[PDB]
Design a protein around this nucleic acid. Structure first.
Ligand code: 1GC
Ligand code: MG
Ligand code: NA
Ligand code: NA
Ligand code: NA
Length: 316
DNA sequence: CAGTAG
DNA sequence: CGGCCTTACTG
DNA sequence: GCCG
């Protein structure tokens, strides 16, 4: 458990401020700093003590000091008054920092303003209409029901189709921001020509209420379980050939920061990691390299010279 | 392509 | 100094 | 932001 909440709680505000304003790299710096402070072992108390920590340098250590000596972060007192609004706006699925800034420059300050006067993409309109629902994390139990709803509908076409809920669900979280379902078939071919039909079925069943993104093997949409007391939830589905199962599973289980770190490691070792496969002899890109055999997730860690980590231990 | 997202 | 993951979808 |  986090031993420096008195520190992170302050930094998160600043990290979020930079994020919504578009300074993504700086925000990344803060995010990683925060992840460190959190996954630490004992409440930090010294400057030199902070600096040592990977992900914390002079400037960050200085800020962690001001927090422990004054219990305050003067920087927080100078956050632009546009931030709360930029955050409100970018919390609409489909709208990022650029759109939020544009809307802000156009004079908009509330979702009422967005609704009545802003230009909205099809995705943003859907994000807006489910604004409150998409900000909520659902109980794990509900995520199971959604997974089962997809698996059932899928297996109705081919009982052999393998369906696994990945993301935060597979990492064992108590609550889930959405549901991520990976679909493949051990026969290495039956997975083809199903996606479309699956969506139609789920749609005719009234389960899928809106689509956000629909690609060849990737679907991002909105669903809602039957009955009263149900809210709309985000649902992501990916269909992959069995030969890419391990890497697809690894990718879709995350976390995002874990994936980025793992991919970064692969890069330093002349390799390349994607949801498709782990490649070696990659000429940085410029050279495709060779695809390494990875039957299971453990193989990927092995080939990268890493101790296997259970899904629950992949927060970053 | 830029923006957004997983 | 300059990357900070990689691929995919939208329009 | 941090780090090589
Ligand atoms: N490489 C990479 N993988 C990513 C990224 N973002 C997501 N993934 C992978 C890893 C991530 O686990 C998975 C699903 O992403 P969500 O569903 O959006 C976030 P989840 O972890 O499920 O937790 P939730 O907040 O939903 O409860 O896609 C990214 O930027 N990069
Ligand atoms: Mg998820
Ligand atoms: Na958004
Ligand atoms: Na997701
Ligand atoms: Na992302």
């Amino acid at each position: 458990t986090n031993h420096n909440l008195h520190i992170t709680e302050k930094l998160e505000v600043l990290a979020k401020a930079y994020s919504v304003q578009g300074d993504k790299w700086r925000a990344l710096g803060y995010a990683k700093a925060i992840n460190a402070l959190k996954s630490f072992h004992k409440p930090v108390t010294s400057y030199q003590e902070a600096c040592s920590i990977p992900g914390i340098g002079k400037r960050m250590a200085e800020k962690i000091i001001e927090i422990l000596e004054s219990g305050h972060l003067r920087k927080l007192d100078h956050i632009s008054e546009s931030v709360p609004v930029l955050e409100l706006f970018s919390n609409i699925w489909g709208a990022g920092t650029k759109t939020a800034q544009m809307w802000y420059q156009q004079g908009f300050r509330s979702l009422e303003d967005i609704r009545s006067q802003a230009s909205l993409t099809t995705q943003q309109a859907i994000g807006l209409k489910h604004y409150s629902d998409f900000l909520e994390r659902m109980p794990r139990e509900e995520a199971t029901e959604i997974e089962q709803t997809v698996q059932k509908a899928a297996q109705a076409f081919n009982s052999g189709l393998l369906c696994v809920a990945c993301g935060s669900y597979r990492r064992g979280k108590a609550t889930c921001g959405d549901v991520d379902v990976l679909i493949t078939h051990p026969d290495g071919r039956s997975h083809r020509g199903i996606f479309s039909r699956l969506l139609d079925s789920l749609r005719q069943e009234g389960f899928l209420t809106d689509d956000l993104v629909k690609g060849e093997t990737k679907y991002l949409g909105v669903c809602r379980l039957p009955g009263p007391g149900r809210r709309h939830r985000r649902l992501d589905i990916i269909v992959v050939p069995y030969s890419e199962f391990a890497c697809a599973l690894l990718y879709f289980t995350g976390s995002a920061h874990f994936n980025r770190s793992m991919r970064a490691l692969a890069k330093t070792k002349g390799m390349s990691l994607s949801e498709h496969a782990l490649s070696t002899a990659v000429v940085r890109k410029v050279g495709p390299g060779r695809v390494l055999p990875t039957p299971t997730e453990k193989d990927v860690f092995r080939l990268l010279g890493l101790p296997y980590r259970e899904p629950a231990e992949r927060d970053w």
